Scaffold this active site. Sequence first.
Site: not given
Ligand SMILES: C[n+]1cn([C@@H]2O[C@H](COP(=O)(O)OP(=O)(O)O)[C@@H](O)[C@H]2O)c2nc(N)[nH]c(=O)c21
Lengths: 288, 287
Positions: B126, B156, B158, B219, B221, B228, B230
């Site tokens: 993704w 994001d 979310k 984050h 872990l 990336h 936040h």
């Molecule tokens: C699969 N996916 C995950 N995310 C976001 O990218 C972040 C990944 O962040 P992380 O720091 O790896 O941990 P977390 O999953 O517990 O939050 C998350 O906040 C998700 O909301 C995503 N965000 C977008 N825009 N598109 C996506 O396909 C996608």
Amino acid sequence: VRLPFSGFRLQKVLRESARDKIIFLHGKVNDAVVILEKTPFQVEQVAQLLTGSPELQLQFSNDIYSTYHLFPPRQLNDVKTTVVYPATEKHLQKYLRQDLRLIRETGDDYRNITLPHLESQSLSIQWVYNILDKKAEADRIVFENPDPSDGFVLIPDLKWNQQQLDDLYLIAICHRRGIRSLRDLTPEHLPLLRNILHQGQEAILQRYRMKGDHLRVYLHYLPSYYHLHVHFTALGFEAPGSGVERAHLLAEVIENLECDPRHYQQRTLTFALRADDPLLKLLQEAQQ
Amino acid sequence: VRLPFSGFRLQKVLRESARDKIIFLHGKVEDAVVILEKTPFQVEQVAQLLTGSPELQLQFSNIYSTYHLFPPRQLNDVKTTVVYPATEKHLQKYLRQDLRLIRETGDDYRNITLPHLESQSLSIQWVYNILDKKAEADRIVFENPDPSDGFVLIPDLKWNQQQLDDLYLIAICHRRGIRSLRDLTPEHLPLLRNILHQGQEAILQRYRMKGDHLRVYLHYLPSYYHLHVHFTALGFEAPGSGVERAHLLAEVIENLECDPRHYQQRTLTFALRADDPLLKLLQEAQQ
Ligand SMILES: C[n+]1cn([C@@H]2O[C@H](COP(=O)(O)OP(=O)(O)O)[C@@H](O)[C@H]2O)c2nc(N)[nH]c(=O)c21
Ligand SMILES: C[n+]1cn([C@@H]2O[C@H](COP(=O)(O)O)[C@@H](O)[C@H]2O)c2nc(N)[nH]c(=O)c21
């Protein structure tokens, strides 16, 4: 099947939390607080809906992931509505919450703006000393190292009722005076910090049967009062207060001191202030 | 529109919370996770509902009165997220588990965590889709296309994009192979700064939200091992923004400026699930 008043003009959003999906409204009627809160899902209703053809509108799609706006039937849409009529000014005051703003305070900013501003107020922490010499709250002491330099008193947070472990909350107040905050810590306080961390944890294992790896242990920068104290919380309990913009893990605070003696005098600390706090205005003015 | 599968046989409730009104569901359709989350309120539209004719139903009463309100269609939006096909990793990720804290030393990361991490992790397809413009291209807020110091800032997953109170964007670097905080050296400083400055300024342009309204962090872990950052409204108490998970970007940059080997030598603190094999591997190494 009707509101206890006629008409509703919104005067002010007293407070909202998108996390808890809730709002507190102050509106004039004909003074009244309305509170709207979304409800928990019921598993069976949602599962039943998903075997069918839910009314969906696509937000986006990426690989295996996708999100939508779902508009479900009446049964899932229940909003808990708590009205308060009439509303005194003390009701409106206890719901009001100020917008927060971030500030990045260099070491120099602390010595030139924050510290002087703090000395100009006269925060009485007499209540803390009453706990320390047992004039108040001795019945609540869970554990004490009585050492005047390196000791502390462990007490349960006032709001933790102690009837469950889900939301365990204790604070350690150091016996030694004059440690205003994170800003005053140097390697000299290491034995104190080690005592709080490891004796605090041993105390909680004994009293409450909670292992150390179930404890978030931290200090607040900008604390609400200026006499060093450490929070011990259950890890499963999430509140504002363990947020990164305010919480510093004690274990890491100790290791910073061991690597870099002047860390907390020289380094920049990030925190949030209410938008009406005079300190916020003073730091802003100095930074431009 | 339609779901990307037909049918849905509930296998298990992975996670359920009354606090923040969310449910995570494992179904057969082939596995799928369907997340349903109640949404924040829209201020101007609740004020509209109340002044007209609300549909109420008394429950309790005293000055305190309580009701069930069943609003019209506009206020009933439920944020719905589907992972399909969900993998075994997705099913454990979302499952309610007892969390334990772990303090991972520099050596623990090299001898234990990283080798485990290289065995497998969640697909990053993704992320490659956002960067290569094969998905979410029309939602890009700002892109710095530099292969090394550049990134793409995007809403994001979310965030339903309906209000600012829970604003949530991520900045994904274009450069590959930066798995997490633990790979960051001083050579990454120009990148990290570009994310901090250009990221914030892009939020200022698009949403009129100043940078002091913003919490900007990584984050540790992370769930996905391609760096990336936040970006959330400060007033939003976002999951994963606790001190045991989040590291402020501005602070990471300054750590690197004071101590180049900071994220290779220092001990980091995070939470792991009880059904995470990593937790056991680390615990065995520390006993
Ligand atoms: C699969 N996916 C995950 N995310 C976001 O990218 C972040 C990944 O962040 P992380 O720091 O790896 O941990 P977390 O999953 O517990 O939050 C998350 O906040 C998700 O909301 C995503 N965000 C977008 N825009 N598109 C996506 O396909 C996608
Ligand atoms: C006056 N006072 C304040 N605190 C703590 O200090 C924090 C700030 O209190 P305020 O709301 O007064 O600013 C709270 O988290 C309380 O738990 C207090 N905690 C205890 N145990 N006893 C006290 O009388 C007392």
